[PDB]
Write a protein that binds this ligand. Sequence first.
Ligand SMILES: [Zn+2]
Ligand SMILES: [Zn+2]
Length: 82
Amino acid sequence: GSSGSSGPCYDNTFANTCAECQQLIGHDSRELFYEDRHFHEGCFRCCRCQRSLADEPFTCQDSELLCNDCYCSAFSSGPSSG
Ligand SMILES: [Zn+2]
Ligand SMILES: [Zn+2]
């Protein structure tokens, strides 16, 4: 990490910025504004298998989103039957 964190500021950015790639939105791209935040038709893909989530059946979660092919997983795999 670093140190010497400077102070904040006040900017007037009038343009949606993907909450994933931190990039503006509007470049001939389909906006996928969600309840959480805005995202690009692409960046808005399962963070497990990178699957497109454009009006598809999935299980949205907190600060995360898993597709119907991921959400239904078995974390058990990780650890063992200690
Ligand atoms: Zn994006
Ligand atoms: Zn998935």
